[PDB]
């Protein structure tokens, strides 16, 4: 029971009142499932458990200091040496140990591969680790255990809330209609309106595909009012026969992609009531039955269905787009080949997950092609897979079981699945499904729940704190609310709630002691908070800041930074390190989330605000933080990151860049904050005091500049190869309801910036056109 109450606070809704056997089915089925995984988990070998709880954070001569669970010993080792070898030094049997990063949830392949080690090499800090014996790891593991060929007709009985009242009714597969829409008669505005009018569609009932959905639009004429959709099949495959009442969603005219569950605010939802003509008790045929069984271009793809399977396995997608889905034989045949289809590359499955592949068998097929996804790939695509959950038609689906499975097998997966689900629980459409999934996951780690509660309580006191700061600053100076802010933070409950947590931005980072002294807040607008931490165990890698925002929408920034991080991975996985900074960014709730602070950096504007001439400002700041020899690295740091963000900002169409939202690190790395727009919703950007830095300050030094210009072009064509990768993810993201990612024209921005129609060298001469266009500043 306490566990039940804990799950209810964490996920934000109470745990029944719907007595819906679909919902009851989901919960007990998935709970058995999730408890199975948590059982398996407790029986893993101790290196298998590290892999679960602390997945290694790789990327695609050396001083290092080691202790055991207070005396440390410093060594030198080879950047090429294996953690084993390090341990063996430390011992003077190594296989009985792992290396923990001090004060992080990280354990340690040549050390040149470990994120924490390069985050130390590139930054001169000296790695500090701890030998943790395998007995002691087992302790954690243990501590964390618990036949009918008439036309389909419905009937539109009547309605309930408020010229002339039309209803439009369409039948769709995906966002394709299996026939013609039917409208109603123009009954008069006011009501509670009556229709009692049979609507009959040009489809045989034996020809509704398993995933068919009836879609209504209620509007007003001499203006739209409400929309609503449902499956003609229940979640047990039973064609549904009867009277259903349809609590409608408000509008924008049909909306086949929107949810198949009704508007839950039954107090003000227009209801549309309707009759489903019974027809005999008909369940959609089993799989085994089914297996027994320009337009000229479509016809010659249906055509050699077989040659496509034989010789073009990955063209699956566009054979599924030519398939006549209203014809049940056209579907048995296609669906018959698909049970023999060779598995597909991840890229191709990322296209199949989309909504214009509604059929649940293809969805299964797509999932099956996704079990080979590495955990690092899953993590990169994870946001899209979450948003695709909104397209599903039932609660129990391969997609949900696949995530839960992966979530429960990698704790960093589970961590982020949780926050993605939790962050939308305020959205009517999805609250039930996301709530239900967070619940099954919680019965998979009763331990991780308690860690997440901990994060939630901090996120909760940050909300209160910001609210007091918004109120307090209305009446008071910036410095007077600041010291009030600290007094509130100093209270009892705030110190306890805000301290000793895993960072929701990155669970491997630990937020221990909140440094009240160094907290502050932006005194403009939504009063975003600056919260700083320290940890004596982690040393300097314990000094970490997080920015809290309450008021702003962070979904867009998060997507943009995932994309830049994807870019940097693509680039690093072709040899090219543009030295990017994809900092953490995570919506946690309604207009609420977190930003990872990048320490030791500032804004162009703050740097320009002051040298004799403004162009000297950046270079002199760089000269100041990188003495003598060291400037030279900064200039290359600066130059690569410049090119990388020039390419990134251009592709993603991020305008509105100015000297307050472009930042620079003391290493010389330049990076962008505050995204919020993108897709133009832009020209190549470039600014002579950047040019100035790239040229070592010398008036014009075309031997530096041109190679900088070669960086940009290399990045641009690297990314241009993976343009489909970018197109497919964004396609899935249209499910997010992001306002700048609304329609088709948004995705057609990306198509252009990525010259995706043209050749590799014709796009690069066109890229060359923009780059000089932009240079004249
Ligand atoms: C207003 C604002 N937005 C941001 C963003 C950002 N991102 N999306 C959307 N807005 C990112 C970073 C940021 C992020 C990472 N590293 C560093 N250094 C940053 F400045 C800082 C941001 N700021 C801030 C600038 C100055 N002072 C701030 C403060 F006192 C408290 C909180 C603030 F947010 C501050």
From Swiss-Prot:
Any single Gene Ontology cellular-component annotation: cytosol
Tissue specificity: Abundantly expressed in adult mouse spleen as well as in testis. Isoform 1 is expressed in spleen and lung (at protein level). Isoform 1 is expressed predominantly in leukocytes.
Reaction(s) catalysed (UniProt annotation): a 1,2-diacyl-sn-glycero-3-phospho-(1D-myo-inositol-4,5-bisphosphate) + ATP = a 1,2-diacyl-sn-glycero-3-phospho-(1D-myo-inositol-3,4,5-trisphosphate) + ADP + H(+); a 1,2-diacyl-sn-glycero-3-phospho-(1D-myo-inositol) + ATP = a 1,2-diacyl-sn-glycero-3-phospho-(1D-myo-inositol-3-phosphate) + ADP + H(+); 1-octadecanoyl-2-(5Z,8Z,11Z,14Z)-eicosatetraenoyl-sn-glycero-3-phospho-1D-myo-inositol 4,5-bisphosphate + ATP = 1-octadecanoyl-2-(5Z,8Z,11Z,14Z-eicosatetraenoyl)-sn-glycero-3-phospho-(1D-myo-inositol 3,4,5-triphosphate) + ADP + H(+)
Region of interest (G-loop), residue spans: 521-527
Main EC class the enzyme belongs to: transferase
Keywords: Adaptive immunity, ATP-binding, Chemotaxis, Cytoplasm, Differentiation, Immunity, Inflammatory response, Innate immunity, Kinase, Lipid metabolism, Nucleotide-binding, Phosphoprotein, Transferase
Record-annotated PI3K-RBD domain positions: 61-133
Subcellular location: Cytoplasm
InterPro entries for this protein: ARM-type_fold (IPR016024), C2_domain_sf (IPR035892), Kinase-like_dom_sf (IPR011009), PI3/4_kinase_cat_dom (IPR000403), PI3/4_kinase_cat_sf (IPR036940), PI3/4_kinase_CS (IPR018936), PI3K-type_C2_dom (IPR002420), PI3K_ABD (IPR003113)
Ranges where the C2 PI3K-type domain occurs: 148-277
A molecular function GO annotation: 1-phosphatidylinositol-3-kinase activity
Name of one Pfam family that matches: PI3K_C2
Keyword flag Cytoplasm: yes
Protein name: Phosphatidylinositol 4,5-bisphosphate 3-kinase catalytic subunit delta isoform
Gene expressing this chain: Pik3cd
């Amino acid at each position: 029971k306490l566990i039940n109450s804990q799950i209810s606070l964490l996920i934000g809704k109470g745990l029944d009142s719907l007595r819906d056997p679909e919902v009851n089915d989901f919960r007990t089925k998935m709970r058995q499932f999730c408890e199975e995984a948590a059982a398996h988990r407790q029986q893993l070998g101790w290196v298998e458990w590290l892999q679960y709880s602390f997945p290694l954070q790789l990327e695609p001569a050396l001083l290092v200091n080691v202790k055991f669970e207070e005396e440390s010993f410093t060594f030198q080792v080879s950047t090429k040496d294996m953690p084993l070898a390090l341990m063996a030094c430390a011992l003077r049997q190594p296989e009985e140990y792992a290396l923990q990063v001090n004060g992080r949830h990280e354990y340690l392949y040549p050390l040149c591969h470990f994120q924490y080690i390069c985050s130390c090499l590139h930054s001169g800090l000296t790695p500090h680790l701890t030998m943790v014996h395998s007995s002691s790891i087992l302790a954690m593991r243990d501590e964390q255990s618990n036949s009918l060929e008439q036309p389909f007709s419905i009937e539109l009985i009547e309605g309930r809330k408020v010229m002339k009242l039309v209803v439009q009714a369409g039948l769709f597969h995906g966002n394709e209609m299996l026939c013609k829409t039917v409208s109603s008669s123009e009954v008069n505005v006011c009501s509670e309106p009556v229709w009692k009018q049979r609507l009959e569609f040009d489809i045989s009932v034996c020809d509704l595909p398993r995933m068919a959905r009836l879609c209504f639009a209620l509007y007003a004429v001499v203006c739209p009012i409400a929309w609503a959709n449902l499956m003609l099949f229940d979640y047990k495959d039973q064609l549904k026969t009867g009277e259903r009442c349809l609590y409608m969603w408000p509008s924008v005219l049909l909306n086949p992609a929107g949810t198949v569950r009704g508007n839950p605010n039954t107090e003000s939802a227009a209801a549309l009531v309707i009759y489903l003509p019974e027809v005999a008790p008909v369940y959609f045929p089993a799989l085994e039955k089914i297996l027994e069984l320009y337009e000229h271009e479509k016809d010659l793809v249906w055509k050699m269905r077989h040659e496509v399977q034989e010789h073009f396995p990955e063209a699956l997608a566009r054979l599924l787009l030519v398939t006549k889905w209203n014809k049940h034989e056209d579907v048995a045949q296609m669906l018959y080949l698909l049970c023999s289809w060779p598995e597909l590359p991840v890229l191709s499955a990322l296209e199949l997950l989309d909504f214009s592949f509604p059929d649940c068998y293809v969805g299964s097929f797509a999932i099956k092609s996704l079990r080979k996804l590495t955990d690092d790939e899953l993590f990169q695509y994870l946001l899209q897979l979450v948003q695709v959950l909104k397209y599903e038609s039932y609660l129990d689906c391969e997609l949900t079981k696949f995530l839960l499975g992966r979530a429960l097998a990698n704790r960093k997966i589970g961590h982020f699945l949780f926050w993605h689900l939790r962050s939308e629980m305020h959205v009517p459409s999805v609250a039930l499904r996301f709530g239900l999934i967070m619940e099954a996951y919680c019965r998979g780690s009763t331990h991780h729940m308690k860690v997440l509660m901990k994060q939630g309580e901090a996120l909760s006191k940050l909300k209160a704190l910001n609210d007091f700061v918004k109120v307090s600053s209305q009446k008071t100076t910036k410095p007077q609310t600041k010291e009030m802010m600290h007094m509130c933070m100093r209270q009892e409950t705030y110190m306890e709630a805000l301290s000793h947590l895993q960072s929701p931005l990155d669970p491997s980072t630990l937020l221990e002691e909140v440094c009240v002294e160094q907290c502050t807040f932006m005194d403009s607008k939504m009063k975003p908070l600056w919260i700083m931490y320290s940890s004596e165990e982690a040393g300097s890698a314990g000094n970490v800041g997080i920015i809290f925002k309450n008021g702003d929408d962070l979904r867009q920034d998060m997507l943009t930074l995932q994309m830049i991080q994807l870019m940097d991975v693509l680039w690093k996985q072709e040899g090219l390190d543009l030295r990017m900074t994809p900092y953490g960014c995570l919506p946690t709730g309604d207009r609420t989330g977190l930003i990872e602070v990048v320490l030791h950096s500032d804004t162009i504007a703050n740097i320009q605000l002051n040298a004799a001439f403004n162009k000297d400002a950046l270079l002199n700041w760089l000269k100041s933080k990188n003495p003598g020899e060291a400037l030279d690295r900064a200039i290359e740091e600066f130059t690569l990151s410049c090119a990388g963000y020039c390419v990134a900002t251009y592709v993603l169409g991020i305008g509105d860049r100015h000297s307050d939202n472009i930042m620079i690190r003391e290493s010389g790395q330049l990076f962008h904050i505050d995204f919020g727009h993108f897709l133009g919703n832009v020209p190549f950007i470039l600014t002579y005091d950047f040019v100035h830095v790239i040229q070592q300050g010398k008036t014009n030094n075309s031997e530096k500049f041109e190679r900088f210009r070669g960086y940009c072009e290399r990045a641009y064509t690297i990314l241009r190869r993976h343009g489909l990768l970018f197109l497919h993810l964004f396609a899935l993201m249209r499910a997010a309801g992001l306002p700048e990612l609304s329609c088709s024209k948004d995705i057609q921005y990306l198509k252009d910036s990525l010259a995706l129609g043209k050749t590799e060298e014709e796009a690069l001469k066109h890229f060359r056109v923009k780059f000089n266009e932009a240079l004249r500043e």
